[PDB]
Design a protein around this ligand. Sequence first.
Ligand SMILES: CO[C@@H](c1ccc(-c2ccccc2)cc1)c1nc2ccc(C(=O)O)cc2[nH]1
Length: 157
Amino acid sequence: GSPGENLKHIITLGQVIHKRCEEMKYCKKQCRRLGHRVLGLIKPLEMLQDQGKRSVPSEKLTTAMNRFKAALEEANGEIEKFSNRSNICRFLTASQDKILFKDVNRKLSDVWKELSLLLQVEQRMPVSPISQGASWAQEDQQDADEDRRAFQMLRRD
Ligand SMILES: CO[C@@H](c1ccc(-c2ccccc2)cc1)c1nc2ccc(C(=O)O)cc2[nH]1
């Protein structure tokens, strides 16, 4: 059983993702949109986080959060190491990819697809409006372009 502390997990760990950009600098550009987009999932979870009283209505839906929780957990964890100047340097210099948190994002949206489905079916709960899939890469790639000049700018010559 236990209290409704588990629910707060998504609330804290959810926003914690964006909190990183607050301390970051090089990834502050990407993390900016990363957290803003990731917060859209926990946003509608804060309004229900309070209503949560009894134990659990259906473990079926709760199971979606169990995995989802880790989905974003990796985001905040990846941003930490990303802070390394060499990490981003070798990444950009490598010229292999354009995004930085595309992996964690792709899964974050994939897990939410079904998850939100269980939360909406179990009870009136507003889920992310975005398509949750390709739309992510669409904006991530378009915005990632800024990283080009944004990065070069950070390193004054
Ligand atoms: C998944 O992590 C917690 C959680 C958080 C949020 C929801 C939720 C539900 C509806 C709409 C939106 C969100 C559900 C579950 C959680 N897992 C549990 C497992 C067992 C019990 C139990 O009492 O046996 C309670 C649990 N509490």
